[PDB]
């Protein structure tokens, strides 16, 4: 090629056009969204078993569902959660890359098989199966600002009015509502009910016989008798709708002339299905929605569209209802795109400038201007092909690639320009001449660079998914670049470039350029003299290399090594845990003081506060609420005392005071989707059936033994504390003595105290649920237990205290199980300075001290990093061997390839330095850039050596070749490295919105860039002469 | 449908939901059945067992499992008056007639409500009047449909949609196929003129 | 149940769930006075029939708890939806020994 | 260009497919016999006259 | 898919099976016809029975 | 999946009562290891022989 396309500029141009086109069509219809699916996909099975112990929900629904939940493809592990409010969750975690639609359907199939094994009330409730990934698009609040509506009223609104339209909005995936539909609430008074010798169970039965659908037949149904003529359906009665219809319904008819109905005995009105979770946006009571993006949608379009839909409904809303949008991914997925077309612009601009500055031509200036965008276009096409998307990482992927993309354009032009000046060949001549020298190398370097980036795409787990994003977007960019810098560029060169006088390096020029050329020219000679001196005096340097190498080896183990960069998304979390036995109303108070403060004392940074009671990241329960703090946009809170990490630093202090409610306060970890990216994560498991008590003390020994270990820090239980519960105790003897029914005993507790889902009732079309339970003042203290009367043999009401006998005993409000056997989740991290594998190696040991029958499993990120980590060395070796082999075949030598590979440290040292200096971590963004810098460094090196080789061959000294090759190479090296480090600086200084990551790459590259330029120029000729000599 | 038997281009226009139908609105005063003896709407075990079928259980029959079915005599569910004939047994043991709690208020609603894209709907069909094409017919319909009480739109479905869609591609089909041809000639002939000579 | 009861207690719920499935072209349900209903979810021309079926089934399972207990303890049918019949294969009686 | 816009626009050509449908719908309420008679006339004024 | 389709029609059967069977726990499985292996457990000093 | 069960009972063994050993009565996998090993071997021979 090249030669072939040098003569066929139009064909060449066509190939451009088609890839340009493919780019475009693609570019405009790629899904756009913030992150791909990093997390290992998970399905969640969940019901509530209205007012039931953790114990019952664990041994009655979890243990049974779990026993059936096997023979499911791609399953990695499974964990459960049985809670005090009576809710449960089985979380089934499958392998990355698992079709989430098959994952889900296999799970709800095993679920379906296990249903008739569950208790009635649970079945009637209906068990929900869904995809548990937390990649939320926006969460929208619906709030009652005059505090007229209760939460329950709002969420019923949401279900009835907002749900179905929002459902039909373009690009809306799965969403969750903060609460549900209304239910016909009914509130049994124990006294009012006792005075007519009536049981709560009587009421249930009454409603069941009195709130039904009359099934209805057909007038003139087939078979009919001869005649018939009129065939019409007969419609009977539907069901009760009004609260009144309910207050009616006859319960007893009295000995005299009268009749008793539900309205005498209980209160009745529409209400909550469940009262466990209460939540409010800035004090004001509120529900809301958490929306997911549908698969392939556009995060930008559909956010705009969700809004549209809601706006079209804001005209119709009851007075004092506001729909505020607290959290929204749009600012960031926008920020990321501007911050790319901006640096792709500044880059093509910057290239143009240094193009001119060195090559005084104007036509030359725009060969790179055509080629770079022809490539970026294509790249979005290849991305399309491989089935990726436009997201945070595929975007940085492009920025990071621009180095490689730009260098490829510069080398090709500067070389024709050079050959033309030094040899006086016509542009067309210089082009083929030039490609003669370059094709070879180029093709080869594409191989080299594929080996540098691909093995990273073979990692597994979340870590791997992230690398694949970079690796593929990059080697795609580079592969395309090579192609167009083989087909288009030389063609453009031969066409658009203008002949230049042999010998004319232009210092006669005068003016500024005359100043420059004379100047640069002198520098070049200096550089030559530099090299020439080094090649004279070898050993000294070779050893100063060996120092710089050690410096790098030392600089590694000394950098803090984290998974991701710390990010300021617009968000902050606050956890509240009021001590065991607190009431939500007593927890609510903490979460309110919390909000007042943030909103008042802190509003320099804080924009809105959403506050939940009876739910947490430690579990659900009346002692548990928390706060999702929404910050105002980064522009509106400059200065590093208004960063999340700062606001959160001081909200610790502000709340440290409380001697009545532990209150953690922390930032979310950058990729929400992945929960908790730090330290380590494990479950302790009761294998040999040893029991909750032993297990509980294995947890506690483990903990107060890690606390006193060098290698670990911050080691907690994720779960919940054990607490007092009320061990109500029946007596079979003295209860059949009063001749009381015993099925009647505990059927009354279930209903009065636990509540009971009795029935359906069409409310405004929608069928909704009818719940029966004791009025609240009737069920708050042991003494209220006595308020309750059951029927015996004769019509005599027997009080509960008659055969009852309460007792404080303590159990658990959160029963955890991991892989079928009961568990306790521990979290922690390694002692500052130390690493994850160290901490596991510690934990590995302190686990051995545990009671027999208790074992353990690693889970979440700790599970993954055990696997991905065992595979690194294999990849690094393959990467190293393969590049080696490519260099061998290019250099027709087993030894020269070393003179290129030894540049690597020279790259990395600077990288490490800058990163460590600016106080940053050894993370994924640093890792990937480090591969960019060493990659672009190998390129430089490859061309120098290749030239030195071509010359040495065309007949001249090893040392004379090395020097003649540098010099020849110096100018494009300087050009492309000046172009880039300038193009990257913004990321280095980047400010707000993704800026944390931009710092991670800006700092890294340009550490390596600076050193790899100012050093390979000297040491590459050393190494080449060095190994050649040898 | 009026305007459609009138319009000269259409031919055979029809609906798909079969109108409204007479439905026998039943009625009970819960209080009166409680006054007699039959308390609680237990009455269903009579209304639906007699006037609808009632799959009770299974019997094998020549080695194959069919259903056992309960339903009233044909002559006992033919007229509003046949409901008179049905005596609910009592809590004492006596036959309360069905006239103690009746009220057949011969009413009427819909036999088949259709629905399309989350709004309610009616589906009309119809061909085009001979010598004309579905496009003509289609264009015609988009007129007769303006005279529709605002707040009532329409949607094409089926063949119509498939045709609406077929027609919209065409522009681009031609553009693209034109363009490819151009470039391939360019490539193959190393000319711009030659391509232009052929587009012309 | 009444056509309108049926339209409002089932069709309404499940239909809203199907909103949002991938490559969805349109939905068209119908409810009858005889109890029966039918939602027909049409997809775009390249959608794999079996993933579409599964996706339907996945959403369907979510609607379930908001359905009448007669409906719910009953079992909802889901199936691929051909418009046309390939052939009617019939049987008739040479003499007259077998009734309809 | 003038000639284009002047041509009518179909989808698929009509085809003597070799089969046809009759579709009967007696007014909202009729008995089995009502429909059945209608259905039995058109089955004659077709199998006998066409 | 085979399994998704079978269970799906198995589904429409379930409401008509006897409680005693439903409660018993039905297994829909996609295995290969033959036994791969038997994992055995055996008592060493006889403390454990069959 | 042989390897993987070998692996599950592998780290369940440390929890079994003192009077109990896991054993592999029936097993099919020995034949495939054996089979492909035997071929490997007659390949290595063929190559020395050739
Ligand atoms: C972290 C992120 C994504 C950046 C963010 C920032 S702000 C925000 N959203 C919230 O701040 C917020 C604010 C209020 N919430 C709530 O009030 C509830 C409580 C909801 C509730 N109340 N009664 N029932 N449910 C809730 N769930 C706390 C409970 C566990 C989670 O799952 C769901 O609640 N899913 C909804 C499905 N329901 C409950 C409807 C199932 C059903 O049909 O019964 C979320 N989550 C929230 C979440 N998320
Ligand atoms: C499964 C397939 C995997 C393939 C992986 C192999 C990667 C190969 C990398 C591309 C190398 C091409 O290398 C090609 O051949 C020889 C090197 O031997 C070189 O040709 C050379 O010959 C002469 C004299 O020998 C020199 O003046 C000069 O160095 C160069 O012109 C060119 O630099 C190049 O055209
Ligand atoms: C011209 C283009 C050339 C560039 C392309 C080069 C691609 C790089 C190849 C690496 C891909 C191979 O995939 C990788 O294989 C190795 C070796 O079996 C695996 O490694 C596995 O076996 C080795 C050897 O027993 C173990 O030390 C290792 O811990 C284990 O995981 C990796 O887990 C897998 O990810
Ligand atoms: C024109 C430009 C072309 C550029 C495009 C190049 C595409 C190359 C992408 C290769 C994708 C590799 O796919 C990835 O393989 C790795 C490693 O084997 C898998 O990881 C898995 O493999 C090995 C098995 O030996 C295990 O050690 C590891 O724990 C496991 O999870 C990933 O789950 C899979 O997704």
PDB file of N, CA and C in Angstrom, chain A residues 479-540:
ATOM      1  N   UNK A 479      -5.063   0.969  15.927  1.00  0.00           N
ATOM      2  CA  UNK A 479      -5.144   0.160  14.717  1.00  0.00           C
ATOM      3  C   UNK A 479      -5.627   0.991  13.528  1.00  0.00           C
ATOM      4  N   UNK A 480      -6.671   1.802  13.737  1.00  0.00           N
ATOM      5  CA  UNK A 480      -7.192   2.659  12.676  1.00  0.00           C
ATOM      6  C   UNK A 480      -6.161   3.662  12.236  1.00  0.00           C
ATOM      7  N   UNK A 481      -5.592   4.384  13.209  1.00  0.00           N
ATOM      8  CA  UNK A 481      -4.507   5.309  12.957  1.00  0.00           C
ATOM      9  C   UNK A 481      -3.410   4.742  12.044  1.00  0.00           C
ATOM     10  N   UNK A 482      -2.805   3.628  12.423  1.00  0.00           N
ATOM     11  CA  UNK A 482      -1.881   2.936  11.532  1.00  0.00           C
ATOM     12  C   UNK A 482      -2.390   2.821  10.075  1.00  0.00           C
ATOM     13  N   UNK A 483      -3.580   2.235   9.886  1.00  0.00           N
ATOM     14  CA  UNK A 483      -4.266   2.162   8.576  1.00  0.00           C
ATOM     15  C   UNK A 483      -4.343   3.501   7.799  1.00  0.00           C
ATOM     16  N   UNK A 484      -4.829   4.548   8.459  1.00  0.00           N
ATOM     17  CA  UNK A 484      -4.986   5.818   7.756  1.00  0.00           C
ATOM     18  C   UNK A 484      -3.650   6.548   7.569  1.00  0.00           C
ATOM     19  N   UNK A 485      -2.715   6.318   8.494  1.00  0.00           N
ATOM     20  CA  UNK A 485      -1.339   6.770   8.339  1.00  0.00           C
ATOM     21  C   UNK A 485      -0.545   5.800   7.455  1.00  0.00           C
ATOM     22  N   UNK A 486      -1.255   4.896   6.791  1.00  0.00           N
ATOM     23  CA  UNK A 486      -0.670   4.080   5.733  1.00  0.00           C
ATOM     24  C   UNK A 486      -1.355   4.296   4.374  1.00  0.00           C
ATOM     25  N   UNK A 487      -2.642   4.660   4.388  1.00  0.00           N
ATOM     26  CA  UNK A 487      -3.432   4.821   3.156  1.00  0.00           C
ATOM     27  C   UNK A 487      -3.720   6.274   2.781  1.00  0.00           C
ATOM     28  N   UNK A 488      -4.215   7.043   3.739  1.00  0.00           N
ATOM     29  CA  UNK A 488      -4.531   8.441   3.525  1.00  0.00           C
ATOM     30  C   UNK A 488      -3.301   9.351   3.578  1.00  0.00           C
ATOM     31  N   UNK A 489      -2.656   9.440   4.747  1.00  0.00           N
ATOM     32  CA  UNK A 489      -1.569  10.397   4.964  1.00  0.00           C
ATOM     33  C   UNK A 489      -0.507  10.451   3.841  1.00  0.00           C
ATOM     34  N   UNK A 490       0.163   9.330   3.542  1.00  0.00           N
ATOM     35  CA  UNK A 490       1.144   9.485   2.458  1.00  0.00           C
ATOM     36  C   UNK A 490       0.530  10.051   1.163  1.00  0.00           C
ATOM     37  N   UNK A 491      -0.722   9.687   0.876  1.00  0.00           N
ATOM     38  CA  UNK A 491      -1.412  10.200  -0.306  1.00  0.00           C
ATOM     39  C   UNK A 491      -1.538  11.700  -0.190  1.00  0.00           C
ATOM     40  N   UNK A 492      -2.251  12.197   0.825  1.00  0.00           N
ATOM     41  CA  UNK A 492      -2.308  13.654   1.124  1.00  0.00           C
ATOM     42  C   UNK A 492      -0.966  14.390   1.032  1.00  0.00           C
ATOM     43  N   UNK A 493       0.044  13.900   1.746  1.00  0.00           N
ATOM     44  CA  UNK A 493       1.421  14.342   1.552  1.00  0.00           C
ATOM     45  C   UNK A 493       1.798  14.567   0.094  1.00  0.00           C
ATOM     46  N   UNK A 494       1.769  13.512  -0.713  1.00  0.00           N
ATOM     47  CA  UNK A 494       2.200  13.634  -2.101  1.00  0.00           C
ATOM     48  C   UNK A 494       1.421  14.706  -2.936  1.00  0.00           C
ATOM     49  N   UNK A 495       0.123  14.794  -2.709  1.00  0.00           N
ATOM     50  CA  UNK A 495      -0.735  15.804  -3.273  1.00  0.00           C
ATOM     51  C   UNK A 495      -0.401  17.180  -2.711  1.00  0.00           C
ATOM     52  N   UNK A 496      -0.927  17.497  -1.533  1.00  0.00           N
ATOM     53  CA  UNK A 496      -0.889  18.843  -0.953  1.00  0.00           C
ATOM     54  C   UNK A 496       0.453  19.528  -0.545  1.00  0.00           C
ATOM     55  N   UNK A 497       1.560  18.802  -0.511  1.00  0.00           N
ATOM     56  CA  UNK A 497       2.815  19.376  -0.005  1.00  0.00           C
ATOM     57  C   UNK A 497       3.614  19.999  -1.120  1.00  0.00           C
ATOM     58  N   UNK A 498       4.432  21.003  -0.786  1.00  0.00           N
ATOM     59  CA  UNK A 498       5.079  21.832  -1.809  1.00  0.00           C
ATOM     60  C   UNK A 498       6.579  21.632  -1.805  1.00  0.00           C
ATOM     61  N   UNK A 499       7.198  21.494  -3.002  1.00  0.00           N
ATOM     62  CA  UNK A 499       8.640  21.213  -3.098  1.00  0.00           C
ATOM     63  C   UNK A 499       9.502  22.204  -2.325  1.00  0.00           C
ATOM     64  N   UNK A 500      10.571  21.703  -1.713  1.00  0.00           N
ATOM     65  CA  UNK A 500      11.536  22.562  -1.041  1.00  0.00           C
ATOM     66  C   UNK A 500      12.968  22.277  -1.477  1.00  0.00           C
ATOM     67  N   UNK A 501      13.742  23.353  -1.599  1.00  0.00           N
ATOM     68  CA  UNK A 501      15.135  23.328  -2.038  1.00  0.00           C
ATOM     69  C   UNK A 501      15.942  22.329  -1.242  1.00  0.00           C
ATOM     70  N   UNK A 502      16.689  21.472  -1.933  1.00  0.00           N
ATOM     71  CA  UNK A 502      17.681  20.635  -1.266  1.00  0.00           C
ATOM     72  C   UNK A 502      18.650  21.502  -0.462  1.00  0.00           C
ATOM     73  N   UNK A 503      18.933  21.055   0.758  1.00  0.00           N
ATOM     74  CA  UNK A 503      19.833  21.750   1.671  1.00  0.00           C
ATOM     75  C   UNK A 503      19.166  22.815   2.525  1.00  0.00           C
ATOM     76  N   UNK A 504      18.101  23.421   2.003  1.00  0.00           N
ATOM     77  CA  UNK A 504      17.468  24.567   2.648  1.00  0.00           C
ATOM     78  C   UNK A 504      16.746  24.289   3.976  1.00  0.00           C
ATOM     79  N   UNK A 505      17.488  24.353   5.080  1.00  0.00           N
ATOM     80  CA  UNK A 505      16.908  24.202   6.410  1.00  0.00           C
ATOM     81  C   UNK A 505      16.443  25.554   6.946  1.00  0.00           C
ATOM     82  N   UNK A 506      16.498  26.561   6.076  1.00  0.00           N
ATOM     83  CA  UNK A 506      15.874  27.869   6.285  1.00  0.00           C
ATOM     84  C   UNK A 506      16.281  28.719   7.474  1.00  0.00           C
ATOM     85  N   UNK A 507      17.452  29.350   7.401  1.00  0.00           N
ATOM     86  CA  UNK A 507      17.894  30.304   8.437  1.00  0.00           C
ATOM     87  C   UNK A 507      18.183  31.660   7.791  1.00  0.00           C
ATOM     88  N   UNK A 508      18.308  31.639   6.467  1.00  0.00           N
ATOM     89  CA  UNK A 508      18.337  32.842   5.664  1.00  0.00           C
ATOM     90  C   UNK A 508      17.051  33.600   5.938  1.00  0.00           C
ATOM     91  N   UNK A 509      15.970  32.831   6.065  1.00  0.00           N
ATOM     92  CA  UNK A 509      14.631  33.270   6.492  1.00  0.00           C
ATOM     93  C   UNK A 509      14.454  34.584   7.259  1.00  0.00           C
ATOM     94  N   UNK A 510      15.343  34.894   8.209  1.00  0.00           N
ATOM     95  CA  UNK A 510      15.174  36.092   9.051  1.00  0.00           C
ATOM     96  C   UNK A 510      13.748  36.270   9.584  1.00  0.00           C
ATOM     97  N   UNK A 511      13.527  37.279  10.421  1.00  0.00           N
ATOM     98  CA  UNK A 511      12.238  37.403  11.099  1.00  0.00           C
ATOM     99  C   UNK A 511      12.273  36.467  12.288  1.00  0.00           C
ATOM    100  N   UNK A 512      11.106  36.112  12.833  1.00  0.00           N
ATOM    101  CA  UNK A 512      11.062  35.192  13.985  1.00  0.00           C
ATOM    102  C   UNK A 512      11.483  33.780  13.611  1.00  0.00           C
ATOM    103  N   UNK A 513      10.951  33.275  12.497  1.00  0.00           N
ATOM    104  CA  UNK A 513      11.255  31.922  12.031  1.00  0.00           C
ATOM    105  C   UNK A 513      12.741  31.722  11.757  1.00  0.00           C
ATOM    106  N   UNK A 514      13.350  32.704  11.097  1.00  0.00           N
ATOM    107  CA  UNK A 514      14.797  32.749  10.919  1.00  0.00           C
ATOM    108  C   UNK A 514      15.508  32.632  12.254  1.00  0.00           C
ATOM    109  N   UNK A 515      14.993  33.326  13.268  1.00  0.00           N
ATOM    110  CA  UNK A 515      15.523  33.173  14.614  1.00  0.00           C
ATOM    111  C   UNK A 515      15.390  31.712  15.099  1.00  0.00           C
ATOM    112  N   UNK A 516      14.205  31.135  14.875  1.00  0.00           N
ATOM    113  CA  UNK A 516      13.873  29.816  15.394  1.00  0.00           C
ATOM    114  C   UNK A 516      14.758  28.751  14.754  1.00  0.00           C
ATOM    115  N   UNK A 517      14.725  28.685  13.421  1.00  0.00           N
ATOM    116  CA  UNK A 517      15.496  27.654  12.738  1.00  0.00           C
ATOM    117  C   UNK A 517      16.961  27.690  13.129  1.00  0.00           C
ATOM    118  N   UNK A 518      17.594  28.856  13.035  1.00  0.00           N
ATOM    119  CA  UNK A 518      18.983  28.956  13.435  1.00  0.00           C
ATOM    120  C   UNK A 518      19.092  28.342  14.822  1.00  0.00           C
ATOM    121  N   UNK A 519      18.196  28.764  15.721  1.00  0.00           N
ATOM    122  CA  UNK A 519      18.191  28.300  17.119  1.00  0.00           C
ATOM    123  C   UNK A 519      17.996  26.777  17.270  1.00  0.00           C
ATOM    124  N   UNK A 520      16.857  26.264  16.789  1.00  0.00           N
ATOM    125  CA  UNK A 520      16.601  24.836  16.855  1.00  0.00           C
ATOM    126  C   UNK A 520      17.756  24.036  16.255  1.00  0.00           C
ATOM    127  N   UNK A 521      18.248  24.506  15.107  1.00  0.00           N
ATOM    128  CA  UNK A 521      19.378  23.896  14.420  1.00  0.00           C
ATOM    129  C   UNK A 521      20.578  23.709  15.358  1.00  0.00           C
ATOM    130  N   UNK A 522      20.874  24.764  16.109  1.00  0.00           N
ATOM    131  CA  UNK A 522      22.001  24.730  17.025  1.00  0.00           C
ATOM    132  C   UNK A 522      21.753  23.687  18.110  1.00  0.00           C
ATOM    133  N   UNK A 523      20.537  23.705  18.662  1.00  0.00           N
ATOM    134  CA  UNK A 523      20.127  22.723  19.655  1.00  0.00           C
ATOM    135  C   UNK A 523      20.377  21.350  19.115  1.00  0.00           C
ATOM    136  N   UNK A 524      19.853  21.088  17.920  1.00  0.00           N
ATOM    137  CA  UNK A 524      20.063  19.790  17.342  1.00  0.00           C
ATOM    138  C   UNK A 524      21.513  19.382  17.396  1.00  0.00           C
ATOM    139  N   UNK A 525      22.417  20.250  16.917  1.00  0.00           N
ATOM    140  CA  UNK A 525      23.850  19.938  16.946  1.00  0.00           C
ATOM    141  C   UNK A 525      24.305  19.586  18.364  1.00  0.00           C
ATOM    142  N   UNK A 526      23.782  20.326  19.345  1.00  0.00           N
ATOM    143  CA  UNK A 526      24.082  20.099  20.773  1.00  0.00           C
ATOM    144  C   UNK A 526      23.673  18.719  21.233  1.00  0.00           C
ATOM    145  N   UNK A 527      22.398  18.414  21.051  1.00  0.00           N
ATOM    146  CA  UNK A 527      21.902  17.050  21.164  1.00  0.00           C
ATOM    147  C   UNK A 527      22.845  16.017  20.519  1.00  0.00           C
ATOM    148  N   UNK A 528      23.287  16.246  19.281  1.00  0.00           N
ATOM    149  CA  UNK A 528      24.157  15.282  18.624  1.00  0.00           C
ATOM    150  C   UNK A 528      25.420  15.090  19.440  1.00  0.00           C
ATOM    151  N   UNK A 529      26.088  16.207  19.750  1.00  0.00           N
ATOM    152  CA  UNK A 529      27.246  16.226  20.639  1.00  0.00           C
ATOM    153  C   UNK A 529      26.989  15.551  21.991  1.00  0.00           C
ATOM    154  N   UNK A 530      25.805  15.772  22.567  1.00  0.00           N
ATOM    155  CA  UNK A 530      25.350  15.003  23.724  1.00  0.00           C
ATOM    156  C   UNK A 530      25.443  13.502  23.475  1.00  0.00           C
ATOM    157  N   UNK A 531      24.605  13.012  22.577  1.00  0.00           N
ATOM    158  CA  UNK A 531      24.630  11.606  22.218  1.00  0.00           C
ATOM    159  C   UNK A 531      26.078  11.117  21.998  1.00  0.00           C
ATOM    160  N   UNK A 532      26.828  11.853  21.176  1.00  0.00           N
ATOM    161  CA  UNK A 532      28.162  11.446  20.758  1.00  0.00           C
ATOM    162  C   UNK A 532      29.097  11.270  21.949  1.00  0.00           C
ATOM    163  N   UNK A 533      28.959  12.179  22.909  1.00  0.00           N
ATOM    164  CA  UNK A 533      29.674  12.132  24.166  1.00  0.00           C
ATOM    165  C   UNK A 533      29.306  10.883  24.966  1.00  0.00           C
ATOM    166  N   UNK A 534      28.001  10.634  25.127  1.00  0.00           N
ATOM    167  CA  UNK A 534      27.495   9.438  25.825  1.00  0.00           C
ATOM    168  C   UNK A 534      28.032   8.165  25.160  1.00  0.00           C
ATOM    169  N   UNK A 535      28.016   8.107  23.836  1.00  0.00           N
ATOM    170  CA  UNK A 535      28.423   6.890  23.159  1.00  0.00           C
ATOM    171  C   UNK A 535      29.911   6.663  23.355  1.00  0.00           C
ATOM    172  N   UNK A 536      30.643   7.745  23.646  1.00  0.00           N
ATOM    173  CA  UNK A 536      32.076   7.693  24.010  1.00  0.00           C
ATOM    174  C   UNK A 536      32.254   7.096  25.398  1.00  0.00           C
ATOM    175  N   UNK A 537      31.437   7.585  26.331  1.00  0.00           N
ATOM    176  CA  UNK A 537      31.619   7.352  27.759  1.00  0.00           C
ATOM    177  C   UNK A 537      30.476   6.536  28.330  1.00  0.00           C
ATOM    178  N   UNK A 538      30.509   5.240  28.042  1.00  0.00           N
ATOM    179  CA  UNK A 538      29.326   4.430  28.226  1.00  0.00           C
ATOM    180  C   UNK A 538      28.989   4.031  29.647  1.00  0.00           C
ATOM    181  N   UNK A 539      29.852   3.203  30.241  1.00  0.00           N
ATOM    182  CA  UNK A 539      29.655   2.638  31.581  1.00  0.00           C
ATOM    183  C   UNK A 539      29.025   3.600  32.617  1.00  0.00           C
ATOM    184  N   UNK A 540      29.578   4.822  32.763  1.00  0.00           N
ATOM    185  CA  UNK A 540      28.974   5.819  33.673  1.00  0.00           C
ATOM    186  C   UNK A 540      27.453   5.891  33.573  1.00  0.00           C
TER     187      UNK A 540
END
